[PDB]
DNA sequence: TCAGGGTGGTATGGCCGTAGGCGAGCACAAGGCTGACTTTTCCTCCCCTTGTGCTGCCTTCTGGGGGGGGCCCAGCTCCTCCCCATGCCAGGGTCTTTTC
DNA sequence: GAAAAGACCCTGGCATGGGGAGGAGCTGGGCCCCCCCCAGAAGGCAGCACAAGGGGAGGAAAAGTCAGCCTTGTGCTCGCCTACGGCCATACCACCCTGA
């Protein structure tokens, strides 16, 4: 049960695709946007944009998480992982 | 006279030129600034450039696409530095896994 | 936009390779970064010495300042051949 | 709502991105509540942006700036 | 840029007890010179952004509400509205 | 300052605003506004680094108070969280 | 054994002077300063400036080094902390 | 060879502020090329500084600079 | 030593007309993706032991901190002026948009 | 990516205030030395508690399977917003003197 893993991590590093659904990111955007001014619009680059950096903050999120797992010693990472690894790099002590 | 031949340069040292006066950067722009300023970006461009073609001669293609100029400034220790919050749109990551996780 | 210039220096060091349509919206931004980071910074270095010109001295610091190493070296270099040979 | 859009399947794709071999079960809301707050805190500014250019439209150019603004300059959206 | 004589004042209508000491003015003096150049440096790429060439009362709004926190934004933009308005009139 | 009420000079943060080359013209109510937002800003850290002054039982400010007063918040530390403060030591945590 | 250690913490931490000793650093900034450029003469208050500077960066590190151990269950702060804070940091 | 000035009890002290309950044997010589790194950038971004003035004195303004280009600003010194 | 009252002007900006691109909304398949389930293997987590490196303490000896003083190169100021960068206009060369 | 037409400012020429480079004077503060002496560093030893290895158990990810659903590629429409244009209104800059 570790094989599938790895032959999934040498598939989603050779790639470059956008791995969120197009549609659900873009209806989260329009729907937190939303609480910062009503009947606002979009366009498709500005979505495109929101989540093309969006997808790349998790990403490195993820590549800071496993380091402190493998820190501890472990290969599943866990939520405070992802604590100390925000709390490091200064986005939310 | 062409003054981005007169230097040697493609870039175009009047448009720097114009650039640096519009940007409100100073009271007085010098007659050596765009001429410089139109140097580096040239050598700066003709690195990474040349850095992504070599990144995509080694995936057997012939256009670079952004995928070869995030793997060429990743894979460079002085263009990691300068492009270290840089958010190259649609590069991928660079391939690499820890030891610790194969088995 | 310096599409042009960037497919002209692309010609000239790679004449076999070609660039995409996005990948070429990245080397504009590219451009674009680098220059108002070096301007910003010889702004800085004009204002704090309490001068009203900006001149290729305060770019020179600002490249020396912002690029690191061997970049810097180099980017010093190509910029005092390409000052030294148009004031020829 | 739409948070539940980033479903387990995209959030497990983004850490194999990331390198990451094993998943814990929590890991899961933890990246949801995080990706929140990112885009929380980015829209906010691109917003105000386009509040100031008097416009109705978020405009590319718009989030760029408030993702310049945040040291996370973003190389592709012109 | 000294702003020593300035901030004692401000603080004798808030505190008419405590001093400044002269390590904790010259802290001021590097905190005011930075929030100014924070905000007229925001206010600044505005005009840029809008292809404008006036930093008005519009630009300060807009840079301190993009750079102070949550309630201090609703604050620093509340007391300067309440000021403006004065200015004018 | 004396027309806006205010104790920071208008004037003054006027020929800053045109000898710093923010703009080629500034309005006559940019410096109004920004002489009562840094105003407000330096009375805002002030009233907590006299606080901590009171609560080390001292008559004078120092850079130890104004450090203490700065972090123990939310958003004054959020806001001055790349700042060294000279001779400010760290929280007791 | 760590009693002494936790007094220890908060006699430091009430503190806000300079940890380390001022002419030893005077000397390792001047030998630093040397390689750059020689004949280089300095302020009293450029060198004090580069000591709060250096001394609040190492406070600093050291309290992520702190959380990159008891993450891994010790106390012992270790080489293999400081680099885990270094590198999430961005530094290395 | 003045990184050695930079003691075992100095390093164990500043530590201590951090936090720092036991040190292990290898943290001195680690933070000694810490800091020497730190130093070696700050004072190189301020020579910059002076030799663009075309002084020969480094001053605290200098340092200031070239501190707030790296991201960490210091208020106290001017 | 610098900000304020008064004059003139002109350029930057405010307001209405406009037309067209793009942004939002609606169906419609229908296959790829997702969600739920099951088995099970591996990973996490706890417990034990030890032996080793870390701490605490004691003594000695050093070298950094606190002054005092000399001097001597360096940074700041003042006045000259000259050489560099700017405001403005003519014309076309180059950069911008479309088509294959 | 190359060919073809257009339109927008690039470059040259002319007159000009001004910005900074230079010489001189000055003074100040940074380096260098001298003395003391006492707190701090360095070394050594006892002892102790903590990191790391070993082991075992169980439970929670992971892999494979199957059924449902819903993103999306497509087509179509409506309209509104926004960049451009035209006219003109007044806000602030350059300048002249003064008083805080």
Not at chain 1, 34 to 57: G, H, N
Not at chain 2, 1 to 23: E, I, M
Not at chain 3, 66 to 83: C, D, F, I, Y
Request: glycine share 6%; aromatic share 6%.
């Amino acid at each position: 049960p570790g094989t599938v893993a790895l032959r999934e991590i040498r598939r989603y590093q050779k790639s470059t695709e956008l791995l969120i659904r197009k549609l659900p990111f873009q209806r989260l955007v329009r729907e937190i946007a939303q609480d910062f001014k009503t009947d606002l619009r979009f366009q498709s680059s500005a979505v495109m944009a929101l989540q093309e950096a969006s997808e790349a903050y998790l990403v490195g999120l993820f590549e800071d998480t496993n380091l402190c797992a493998i820190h501890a010693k472990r290969v599943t990472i866990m939520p405070k992982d992802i604590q100390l690894a925000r709390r490091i790099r200064g986005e939310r002590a | 006279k062409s003054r981005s031949s007169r230097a040697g340069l493609q870039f175009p040292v009047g448009r720097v030129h114009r650039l640096l006066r519009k940007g409100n950067y100073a009271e007085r722009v010098g007659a050596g600034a765009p001429v410089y300023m139109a140097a580096v970006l040239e050598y700066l461009t003709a690195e990474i450039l040349e850095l992504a073609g070599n990144a995509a001669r080694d995936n057997k293609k012939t256009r670079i696409i952004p995928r070869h100029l995030q793997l060429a400034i990743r894979n460079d220790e002085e263009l990691n530095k300068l492009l270290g919050k840089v958010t190259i749109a649609q590069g991928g990551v660079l391939p690499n896994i820890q030891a610790v996780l194969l088995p | 936009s310096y599409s042009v210039y960037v497919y002209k220096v692309l010609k000239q060091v790679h004449p076999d390779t070609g660039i995409s349509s996005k990948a070429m919206g990245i080397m504009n931004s590219f451009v674009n970064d680098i220059f108002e980071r070096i301007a910003g910074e010889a702004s800085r270095l004009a204002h704090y010495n309490k001068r009203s010109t900006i001149t290729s001295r305060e770019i020179q610091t600002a490249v020396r300042l912002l690029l690191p190493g061997e970049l810097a070296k180099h980017a010093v270099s190509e910029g005092t051949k390409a000052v030294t040979k148009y004031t020829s | 709502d739409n948070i539940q859009g980033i479903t387990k399947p995209a959030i497990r794709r983004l850490a194999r991105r990331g390198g990451v071999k094993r998943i814990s079960g929590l890991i899961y809301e933890e990246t949801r509540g995080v990706l929140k707050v990112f885009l929380e805190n980015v829209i906010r500014d691109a917003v105000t942006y386009t509040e100031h250019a008097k416009r109705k439209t978020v405009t590319a150019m718009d989030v760029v700036y408030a993702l310049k603004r945040q040291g996370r300059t973003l190389y592709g959206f012109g």
